[PDB]
From a paper:
The two structures reported here were solved from a single cryo-EM data set. A data set of each type (822 small and 663 large) was collected, and a structure for each was determined using single particle image processing and icosahedral averaging. The smaller particles generated a structure that, at least at the intermediate resolution of our map, is indistinguishable from previous X-ray structures of mature ERAV, while the large particles generated an expanded structure unlike any seen for any picornavirus capsid to date. As expected, the coordinates fit into our native (small) structure extremely well as a single intact unit, confirming that the smaller structure is of the native virion. However, it is tempting to speculate that the polyanionic genomic RNA must play a role, and this seems plausible given the amounts of electron density for encapsidated RNA seen in the two structures. Shown in Fig. 5a is a central, 40-Å-thick slab through the structure of the native ERAV particle, which shows that the volume encapsidated by the protein shell is full of density that we attribute to the ∼8-kb single-stranded genomic RNA packaged in the mature virion. For ERAV, which is very similar in structure to FMDV, the X-ray structures of both the native virion and low-pH-induced empty particle are extremely similar, with a root mean square deviation between the structures of only ∼0.9 Å (15).
Numbering used by the authors:
A (entry chain C0), F (entry chain CP): 12 to 20, 22 to 30, 32 to 40, 42 to 50, 52 to 60, 62 to 70, 72 to 80, 82 to 90, ...
B (entry chain FR), J (entry chain FP), K (entry chain FQ): 16 to 36
C (entry chain DP): 1 to 226
D (entry chain AP): 1 to 246
E (entry chain AS): 100 to 197
G (entry chain DQ): 58 to 226
H (entry chain AQ): 198 to 246
I (entry chain AQ): 1 to 99
The structure:
């Protein structure tokens, strides 16, 4: 049995998982905010279909948790109106018998050409080392659990400073069908309110 | 016999029926 | 065997207040709990712990100018259908009935400028004469004098004094049981202001709290609307 | 006494020889005053055939101030059982219905409706239909004759149906996601049920519904509506009473 | 013959014009406003086939007076009028509207 | 001293107040929601200038907490995305020496001509009884505190069912200037999230 | 007309299954639990559903369910629906799944009979989505996978009030 | 049997006290199927208007 | 919860704040729902003379779904007593049988 | 309330009325 | 079942109903 049911808030059952905590367990209000909300269990419960894996030469990855994809519905509304101290919990892939492996990793992340904060950028090959940043998916063994703690240079503006997850193709081959996922989610979630948008 | 109601003895058994000895 | 009974002549008649219910055609209906606060068992209860503005002239308050003195300020025949006591909770409750036995209380909330003082007099005139019309006539009865300035309102208890243990919740032609008298308030000292210019008149609210010994007995259907 | 008013809370004075109680307030007791069959409403029965207009026992409407109307709208929420007593005033020559069965069938909050024919009593010819949902079963039927009956009436218990923990009289909001002019003070089923009256009569008589509201619980007081015009200032209002003068 | 015997307690109002009406196929027969059922106990009995066209009930002491004075020496209202002598406001048991 | 500083979340100091709890103290999750957020202290902290008191014949009042005026900024965003169990805490007026009294009351409220949920409707005069629904302001004594508990026929859709506050003119007179307020605020605040608005 | 939906490797966005959670909504028409109901007038229970996936043993489908409380007008993409209460499940070794559609509403009992939009009729929708389009050994042999939608009465569910049957409609 | 037979019918009735039931069985729908995705709408106590 | 279905036996999920009971199921109680005089059947009486058609009280037939019909055919075997209540709707001028 | 007759409980309070909790 | 009146046993349970074993 590979029962991998993970709950926060949205009960993700999924067999496929084979529970990697990245660096540490999440934590105690900011050190530097003499400012007064512990977002509730609802809200801080999402699931984005990432892309559709296809001749994709080792190096291609699915890039920043979670801006641009934040706008997608109850937690989102909140971080709109300064700063947020929150780790994450998050991948799934639909395949078979006749099928490519992925090094899916949680990066603490350079790059994203000032067009940072989700898409398809390659990486510079040397995947040889992406296995050093706490993280694989192998179609010959499964289909899924990166759980991370809060990080930033003691809290931060999540509309400007992103835990950013990647997914690189170490080795796809088999039947001609697609091979299409990821269930993102905040954890331990924000300081002082901001002016009405009027 | 067929008198299983708790009102049968409204008339005590002297008036009701007979008596033997 | 069969019991012997005899129907009263009345028998197969209605009875719009039979002390005893009817046949339970639906049963076992368990009912859900109620968490709403501000509940009540007794109606007197609500009118005791709650006042209501008496309607003088069309408003709930009289005036106080620096040109009064003698004249009466407020007057009304203490009976639960006398003009002023018409719109009040305490009086409107009453009409589901036929009788009351209570002394009433009134509270005088003075609303004039905070640079205004009015000083003053209230008086209860038991039934006899034909309405005294000057304090000099009224002060010889039961009265109270009050000085606004630091108080910020006042209270007067119009008691219950009469030979009958219950009176009428309905007014009618002069009876020994309808009228309990009048309630009067007077200008024992004509109002004053920083400037007669800025502050013309002062006012005063006339709120009616049910007395502490007051109760309504006897429910009665409503007559016609008149 | 010097009152520092304005902060809601009333203010008393208490004279000398304060007066002793008697009556005990008692006659003002909510549950008590409401535990008596009132004459409220009045309708027209159905012919056994055709489709009915399911009557609904919603006594939270008021208007004709028969001192039961105001009393119900003195509270905000109300919870009580019900009990009814249909009677039936003949409207013409009280010897034209040599029988008149009346299928008074009560329904609980939510029961379906659509009642066309489905029953039929066969006997020598003719055969007289009964309303489909009218027959007997789940929801309590009462069959009483309108001939020789020394009281063409019935009457029974009807425990609180409605889903709501308590019945809201005046609702500020709406009843359905179709914020429509009607569903304002409506709220889905703030009531006691329905009743379907069918009899070979329908004409030649009416009824006089009635309500006995045992276990009446009232919440959230409200102001009590005057019910009588204003008089002439300074004076008394004069209604001809038992007492009066002459 | 339905008879709306309605009893009233000492002091109950009066003025009873129409306000009720029973609708049924046409005609519609009115009932007296204060006659209907409610506060003060109504009794509806038929005058047909009724082996005793009668009713009957309790009526506890209404009147305000600690006791009922039969013969009064004084008057009933501040209008010392010929009538209010042996009258006294409501030395009685109530009313009835048939 | 008439120090009337009231805090929830926004520290309202105001002398003027002379603390009326309406019916009861606020309360324990819905009886009928086998459904999983205790809105935090931020968010559930607002202050609407009500109107500008002016010859206004006793009877005029300022009418429904809080729809239409809900759209005004952090709590608002939340109740958008089913049902909410919450009481309230809330009036202030700017006057002088040469100045009208108001019976400001919390109604459990008919009326609002199917144009319900804030404005200037009159009332039918009989103000004679509005003093029966837990509640005055008197320019000769002050300038302000109605604190209420949750009510509804065990919880409810605040976009359809409104505690609605009123303010009736029992008796204005003095200097020709205006006489312009109210600090609204939820308390003990909502069940299951709703679909993204996309 | 069948007791199951499909799962192809060409789905994704689209909804998979949807129905207005009220004891006379299409799907819940033939069920024991729903047909029982009509002897009455009221229910107060959260329901459970079990998803028995029946595709080839060489098939995997992964997936998503979602309960949409009443408000909007039916979200029509998971990206809209996932922002509500949902569960994700991966067939492969499970061999079926269970989701409990709770009871959340202001009324202590609702209607066993559906009718024009009321605050008391509709409890919402029940939705299932293709969080990952199906897969097979060969798209050739295994076209589609299926899944059974079985309805167990919830653990807090009860019917109150018996009522005669209306007309047949 | 009665001198009647015509000029009237009857309406039998049953009161089934001490009803004991065994071996459940499936419960018959009693109502057609509606239009997919939606609700069936029977005029009730409730309803809208 | 992960269900390993197929072997008959259902499968539950149980949310948070599970909901309290009330009503107690009670209104679904077999013996109870069936202890009430239903209007089932309806016939024509006999003339005293001639030969009769002995009527038989077999209420296990159903068809017109008056919620009593279905309910009896929800079980396989049934055992209960009976109690009847004949009434008799006059079919013409209810003053032609003086007895 | 107005039911002071010693026959009111002929129908026990379950059938009579409702129940709360 | 629906018989919550204290008169149901006027006829003792032998005459009333049946009996099992």
């Amino acid at each position: 049995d590979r029962i991998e049911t993970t709950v926060v808030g949205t009960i993700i059952n999924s067999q496929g998982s084979v529970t990697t905590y990245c660096y540490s367990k999440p934590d105690r209000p900011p050190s530097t905010v003499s400012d007064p909300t512990r977002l509730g269990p609802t809200l801080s419960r999402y699931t984005f279909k990432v892309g559709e894996w296809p001749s994709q030469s080792h190096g291609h990855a699915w890039i920043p948790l979670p801006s641009d994809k934040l706008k997608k519905g109850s937690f989102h509304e909140v971080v709109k109106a300064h700063l947020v101290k929150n780790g994450w919990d998050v991948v799934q892939v639909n395949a078979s018998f006749a099928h490519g492996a992925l090094c899916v990793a949680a990066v603490p992340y350079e790059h994203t050409h000032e067009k940072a904060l989700w898409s398809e950028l390659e990486e510079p090959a040397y995947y040889q080392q992406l296995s050093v940043f706490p993280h694989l998916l192998n179609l010959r063994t499964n289909s899924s659990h990166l759980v991370m703690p809060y990080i930033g240079p003691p809290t931060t503006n999540l509309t400007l400073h992103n835990w950013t997850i990647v997914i690189l193709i170490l080795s796809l081959t088999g039947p001609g069908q697609t091979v299409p996922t990821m269930s993102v989610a905040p954890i331990d979630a924000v300081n002082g309110p901001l002016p009405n948008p009027e | 016999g067929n008198s299983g109601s708790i009102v049968q003895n409204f008339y005590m058994q002297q008036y009701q029926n007979s008596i033997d000895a | 065997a069969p019991i012997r009974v005899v129907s009263v002549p009345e028998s197969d008649s209605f009875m719009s207040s039979v002390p005893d219910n009817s046949t339970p055609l639906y049963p076992k209906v368990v009912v859900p709990p109620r968490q709403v606060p501000g509940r009540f068992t007794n109606f007197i209860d609500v009118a005791k712990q709650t006042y209501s503005f008496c309607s003088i002239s069309g408003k709930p308050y009289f005036e106080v100018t620096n040109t009064s003195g003698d004249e009466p300020l407020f007057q009304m025949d203490v009976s639960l259908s006398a003009a002023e006591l018409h719109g009040t909770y305490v009086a409107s409750l009453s009409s589901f009935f036929a009788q009351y036995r209570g002394s009433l209380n009134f509270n005088f909330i003075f609303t004039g400028a905070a640079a205004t003082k009015a000083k003053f007099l209230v008086a209860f005139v038991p039934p006899h004469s034909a309405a005294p019309k000057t304090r000099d006539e009224a002060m010889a009865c039961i009265h109270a004098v009050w000085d606004v300035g630091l108080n910020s309102a006042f209270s007067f208890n119009v008691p219950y004094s009469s030979p009958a243990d219950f009176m009428a919740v309905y007014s009618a032609e002069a009876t020994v049981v309808n009228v309990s008298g009048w309630l009067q308030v007077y200008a024992l000292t004509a109002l004053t202001s920083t400037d007669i210019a800025v502050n013309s008149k002062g006012r005063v609210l006339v709120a009616v709290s049910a007395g502490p010994d007051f109760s309504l007995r006897h429910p009665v259907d409503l007559p016609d609307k008149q | 006494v010097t009152n520092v008013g304005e902060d809601g809370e009333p203010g008393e004075t208490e004279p000398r020889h304060a007066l002793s109680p008697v009556d005990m307030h008692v006659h003002t007791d909510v549950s008590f005053l409401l535990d008596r069959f009132f004459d409220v409403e009045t309708l027209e029965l159905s012919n056994l055939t055709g489709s009915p207009a399911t009557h609904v026992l919603d006594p939270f409407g008021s208007t004709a101030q028969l001192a039961w109307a105001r009393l119900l709208n003195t509270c905000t929420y109300f919870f009580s059982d019900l009990e009814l007593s249909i009677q039936f005033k003949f409207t013409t020559t009280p010897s034209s219905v040599g029988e008149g069965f009346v299928w008074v069938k009560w329904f609980p909050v939510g029961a379906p409706t659509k009642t066309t024919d489905a029953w039929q009593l066969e006997g020598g010819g003719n055969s007289v239909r009964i309303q489909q949902l009218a027959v007997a079963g789940m929801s309590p039927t009462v069959v009483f004759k309108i001939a020789g009956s020394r009281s063409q009436a019935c009457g029974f218990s009807v425990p609180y149906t409605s889903m709501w923990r308590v019945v809201p009289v005046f609702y500020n909001g709406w009843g359905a996601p179709t914020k429509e002019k009607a569903t304002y003070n409506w709220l889905p089923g703030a009531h006691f049920g329905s009743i379907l009256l069918t009899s070979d009569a329908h004409d030649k008589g009416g009824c006089y519904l009635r309500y006995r509201f045992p276990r009446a619980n009232m919440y959230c007081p409200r102001p009590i509506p005057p019910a009588f015009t204003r008089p002439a200032d300074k004076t008394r209002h004069k209604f001809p009473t038992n007492i009066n003068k002459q």
